[PDB]
Write a protein that binds this DNA or RNA. Structure first.
Length: 106
DNA sequence: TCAGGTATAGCACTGAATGACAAAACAAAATGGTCGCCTGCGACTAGAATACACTGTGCTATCATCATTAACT
């Protein structure tokens, strides 16, 4: 029990939320937690910044949609959180060091 | 009942993340070049001369409109 069961709610919010980005103001409101409700969790249970963890989660979620043989490549990053194509391209290039088409063909 | 404390939240700050503009590359589409077929036109010089189309609805049941026939005037 950390801050009255915030771990059991963060995962549910991440799984049920839409492609809306997750920031301090967005998440803290109806999350049941303060900025400090989440800082201690991100420091202890995860030990990683939010901008990197959210990007990794989006990449792991899109790894299946890229294999689902979808022709609308521009909408894949949009349906999962990336509001722009260039941001998703840079994130994928810095993470996997591979072009988007090279991983989409696989 | 007043107080030390741990749990929870706001605050100060560099530097990484996230926008906007421009250029290079690939696929879809319209335009143009080229090959083989379809087609329009002309010619083939023994003699061949109105006879081959062919008909067949069948004559019901009346009814009304137009020029030739015969004859009164």
């Amino acid at each position: 029990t950390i801050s009255a069961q915030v771990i059991d709610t963060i995962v549910e919010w991440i799984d049920d939320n839409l492609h809306q980005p997750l920031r301090i103001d967005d998440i803290a409101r109806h999350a049941g937690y303060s900025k400090w409700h989440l800082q201690r969790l991100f420091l202890q249970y995860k030990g990683e910044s939010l901008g990197r963890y959210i990007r990794e989660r989006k990449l792991l979620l899109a790894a299946r949609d890229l294999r689902d043989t979808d022709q609308r490549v521009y909408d894949i990053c949009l349906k999962y959180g990336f509001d722009s194509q260039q941001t998703f391209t840079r994130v994928f290039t810095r993470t996997f060091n591979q072009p988007p088409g090279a991983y989409r063909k696989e």
